[PDB]
Ligand binder design. Structure first.
Ligand code: 95K
Length: 377
């Protein structure tokens, strides 16, 4: 099994106990650590934060403590846009420029692979031709990584991609059966299914549909997303199930209607550390005073409300349920967004350090046998 965990290079700017740096990383928590995010300049892989080079050394230095650990660098993300990807994949010359830059960059900074996080080929302004061009890019990278391993004698660079759960995005951008052959693993973004952009409450990451749902809405859940990627040609062993250590919040139209599907007027109040209306870290919801926690029985996940605020999130129990699910489906493991959103320092939830991600590791049977300081949940 794999446990693929994302580090984010902006968590270093959060205040107080929420500030996260590579020092807060546990070298033996995950099997693969992915650094979010790199960018692109003139079709070449590039840093995005002023101190990325410092952080890369600390991040990849974790492998000194755990030589088994693999690291990857993720390019893109949700603020990156699409134009730079579109321009880079548009010609063979630009793709070659990118691919060669990626090999040099990853080797220079001691990463073991590249994770593609384009949001998304064929959507969000990206033209329809980017669907096939993304396939070509994936093939170009896979082939070049294979060739570099041959010529250099080094362990082949890994290639993964973070892929959407929603059918509209999948069909607009992803030749699933083709790309799955060339990717080492597929990081399924099984979250952001619902959120404050919608006019009624809904859970960030429900495992199954609600009985009431119909039409396209009935596929906005983890099980449908997993089945979608499997049926479209992803080998189960390559499919890695995303798990969110965050929730999505709503302001309710009325404090008297707190159901799933209740009317909402907009995003929930921003969290005190993450400061982004509509989202909350696990550590911002786990210890909410004077709130009422509920479970969505059909969907196997919790929500919590207080006054006119409503948040759908994941807890230890839902992570256990989702790992049981992924094992039943024979998936390759779990992926987690993100290290810095779990209670990484144990400052909030009274569950020790990394309670959610340790739950994943435990349920995947990935606890190191020589481990001393872990915490079972
Ligand atoms: C703007 C928002 C809808 C993006 N979404 C949630 C990110 C996020 C989570 C928690 C908080 Br607090 C603030 C922002 C991302 C989740 C992670 N995801 C992702 N990218 N790559 C992987 N493997 N997962 C990209 C979207």
């Amino acid at each position: 099994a794999k446990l693929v965990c994302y580090f984010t290079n902006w968590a270093q700017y959060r205040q107080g106990e929420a500030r996260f740096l590579p020092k807060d990383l546990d070298p033996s928590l995950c099997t693969h650590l992915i650094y979010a995010f790199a960018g692109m300049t003139n079709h070449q892989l590039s840093t995005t934060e002023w101190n990325d080079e410092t952080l890369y050394q600390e991040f990849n230095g974790l492998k000194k403590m755990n030589p088994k650990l693999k690291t990857l660098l993720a390019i893109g993300g949700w603020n990156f846009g699409t134009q730079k990807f579109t321009d880079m994949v548009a010609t063979a010359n630009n793709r070659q420029t990118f691919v060669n830059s990626a090999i040099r960059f990853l080797r220079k900074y001691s990463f073991d692979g590249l994770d593609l996080d384009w949001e998304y080929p064929g959507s969000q302004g990206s033209p329809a031709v980017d669907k096939e061009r993304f396939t070509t890019l994936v093939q170009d990278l896979a082939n070049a990584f294979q060739q570099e391993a041959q010529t250099s004698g080094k362990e082949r660079l890994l290639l993964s991609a973070a892929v959407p759960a929603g059918q509209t995005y999948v069909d607009a951008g992803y030749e699933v059966d083709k790309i799955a052959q060339n990717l080492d693993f597929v990081n399924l973004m099984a979250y952001d299914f619902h959120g404050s952009w919608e006019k009624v409450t809904g859970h960030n990451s429900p495992l199954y549909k609600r009985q009431e749902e119909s039409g396209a809405a009935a596929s906005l859940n983890v099980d449908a997303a997993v089945q979608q990627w499997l049926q479209k040609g992803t080998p189960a062993s390559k499919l890695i199930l995303g798990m969110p250590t965050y929730g999505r919040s709503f302001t309710l139209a009325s404090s008297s209607d707190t159901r799933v599907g209740a009317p909402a007027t907009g995003s929930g109040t921003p969290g005190p550390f993450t400061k982004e209306g509509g989202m909350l870290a696990y550590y911002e919801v786990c210890s909410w005073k004077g709130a009422t926690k509920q479970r969505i029985q059909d969907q196997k996940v919790p929500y919590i409300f207080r006054d006119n605020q409503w948040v759908g999130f994941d807890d230890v129990e839902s992570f256990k349920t989702k790992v049981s699910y992924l094992k039943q489906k024979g998936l390759g493991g779990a992926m987690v967004w993100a290290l810095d959103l779990d209670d990484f320092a144990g400052f909030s939830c009274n569950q020790g350090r990394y309670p959610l991600i340790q739950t994943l590791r435990q349920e995947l049977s990935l606890v190191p046998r020589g481990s001393h300081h872990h915490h079972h949940h």
